[PDB]
Design a protein around this ligand. Sequence first.
Ligand SMILES: NC(=[NH2+])c1ccc2[nH]c(-c3cccc(OC4CCCC4)c3[O-])cc2c1
Ligand SMILES: [Ca+2]
Length: 223
Amino acid sequence: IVGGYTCGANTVPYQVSLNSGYHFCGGSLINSQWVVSAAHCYKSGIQVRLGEDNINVVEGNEQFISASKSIVHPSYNSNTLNNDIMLIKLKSAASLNSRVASISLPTSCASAGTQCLISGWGNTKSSGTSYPDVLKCLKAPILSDSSCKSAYPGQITSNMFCAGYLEGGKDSCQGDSGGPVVCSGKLQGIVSWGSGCAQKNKPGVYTKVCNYVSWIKQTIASN
Ligand SMILES: NC(=[NH2+])c1ccc2[nH]c(-c3cccc(OC4CCCC4)c3[O-])cc2c1
Ligand SMILES: [Ca+2]
């Protein structure tokens, strides 16, 4: 996160770290055995880490659970990043409490102007790499489709939305991929891509979760 602040230990209880010997993406806990992330974060050998704050130290509250299966959306296109969503089933259910909790799926899409919280252990510099130890947060508004599309002409599909600041300085970045964009207590986005990080007129692009609520439910129900 660039231009973000320290969230505070466990203040974001649905945030998970996807790890394979190092943190590479984020994800959101939606129920004791399922997490939602970005299809582009897929790999084998993923251990899901819950109750994390500082990713390099064990401080208590952490639950490390291996992933049983990752389900990349059947229509994910790695060249356009359209349908950039994946579901991971955990080997065992997580113990939920106030430090580890799931987040709710939306009943409706959100509108431009809605303020959302984005979190992650991704890069904090726009020019260079600086990865934090603790979880960073950023409050960002969903942008209008005309501003999104004027920013990335021909690259936005209807399963994407832009959120951020066109002046630059505050944005999500690499390492945050796969994680949550929560608005009014509902998971509305998944960190997906953008051009550089916190650059002027290049806001972040997120996977529009409201368009997959039925797919997520049908898939969890059949697995
Ligand atoms: N400007 C933004 N709001 C933004 C948001 C998410 C991003 N993710 C990335 C990104 C860049 C290089 C590699 C990535 O994923 C690989 C790391 C782990 C496995 C996949 C990214 O997600 C850039 C990037 C930029
Ligand atoms: Ca830790």
